[PDB]
Amino acid sequence: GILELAGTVGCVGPRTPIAYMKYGCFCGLGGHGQPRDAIDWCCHGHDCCYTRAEEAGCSPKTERYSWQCVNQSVLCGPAENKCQELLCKCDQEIANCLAQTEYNLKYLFYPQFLCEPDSPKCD
Ligand SMILES: NC(=O)c1ccc(Cc2ccccc2)cc1
Ligand SMILES: [Ca+2]
Secondary structure, three states, X not given: OHHHHHXXXXXXXXXXXXXXXXEOXXXXXXXXXXXXXXXXXXXXXXXXXXXXXXXXXXXXXXXXXXXEEOXXXXXXXXXXXXXXXXXXXXXXXXXXXXXXXXXOHHHEOOOHHHOOOOOOOOO
């Protein structure tokens, strides 16, 4: 869920999860257009992951799951079901993705009217 998403991102990366709350075209609720940079690609890929999780019959924004932060790395588990494993995998992936990125301040609160109607495909 959102609590774990924030935690995992904070665990691995060098910056507050708030840094991604409305950034580029994809970091934040929803998202569309051409991803603006590496961080925006991470969020695009995460949005895709959550959509897949929803299609599998999970609730990616709400379901709690256990994880550990060890040496600024996310370890997923113990998982009680498949949704908890999918969710944790999604969040672990974006945490790892964002941790390797440099922040472009100019994309924080980027104007949504510049984000194109269509988006790159998932997978
Ligand atoms: N995929 C996304 O759009 C996306 C959006 C935000 C974050 C980081 C965050 C997590 C919880 C609360 C605020 C920020 C990660 C991914
Ligand atoms: Ca998004």
